């Protein structure tokens, strides 16, 4: 269903498969904000390593739910960004500050547990 199971240690580990469109990301937007309240989380970890190409209008929604998930009290992290998709994040109107990208899911939870509790 593209939105995998995520609860771990009062943090969330939501992976992403190969996407289809931003109308699939519409489903991805509702099924992240709903889970972050009922499971009272503190930080969402996103693994976009599976994708290798992303539409420019998609990244102004996946990049925009960063602003939504920060407002519900979750300093999210975007682990494992590929090179070719990052060349679609240069001609974008970048204001990517406070997003806290990382390298892998190993180092991703190492940085998030620094900003919470441990």
């Amino acid at each position: 269903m593209g939105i995998p199971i995520l609860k771990l240690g009062e943090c969330l580990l939501i992976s992403i498969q190969s996407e289809l469109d931003d109308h699939t990301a519409v489903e991805f937007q509702e099924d992240l904000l709903a889970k972050i309240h009922e499971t009272s989380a503190r930080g969402v970890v996103i693994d976009i390593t599976s994708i290798d190409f992303i539409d420019s209008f998609i990244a102004k929604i996946l990049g925009d739910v960063v602003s939504m998930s920060k407002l519900m009290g979750a300093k999210v992290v975007v682990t494992g960004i590929q090179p070719a998709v990052a060349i679609t994040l240069i001609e974008l109107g970048i204001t990517f500050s406070g997003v806290l990208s990382a390298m892998d899911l190993e180092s991703g939870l190492e940085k998030l547990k620094q900003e919470l509790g441990e």
Partner: protein, 116 residues
């Protein structure tokens, strides 16, 4: 006449309550907030809008005055935004998850820790 929105006055973090009042004519939640901010002092305060569906098109009375109250109230914070409410995105302010872990970090900003 329903001459109330809500306003409480506890110890120095003086928080607030907001029900479903999603209309621009409720500008009364501003002067009732401003006049108490020099009645007693308040080094931090919360809002607790956990029940509101939904802000129509006007955060310019909600999130605009949050920096127009930094001038007096020293860093207001939102408590418990709903799921569908943050779908409103025209375009910051400290926020949190809920009151029981929003009050504690609002006690951290005033030299008070919970000790048993």
């Amino acid at each position: 006449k329903s001459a109330l929105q809500e306003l409480s006055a506890p110890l120095l973090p003086i928080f607030e309550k907001i029900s479903v009042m999603p209309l621009i004519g409720t500008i009364d939640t501003e002067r009732a907030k401003l006049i108490i901010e020099n009645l007693l002092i308040g080094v931090v305060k919360n809002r607790s809008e956990v029940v509101l569906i939904d802000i129509t098109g006007v955060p310019v009375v909600d999130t605009m005055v949050a920096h127009h109250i930094i001038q007096a109230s020293e860093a207001v914070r939102l408590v418990g935004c709903q799921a569908m409410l943050v779908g409103i995105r025209p375009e910051q302010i400290i926020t949190t998850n809920t009151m029981k872990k929003g009050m504690e970090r609002a006690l951290a900003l005033t030299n008070r820790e919970i000790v048993e």
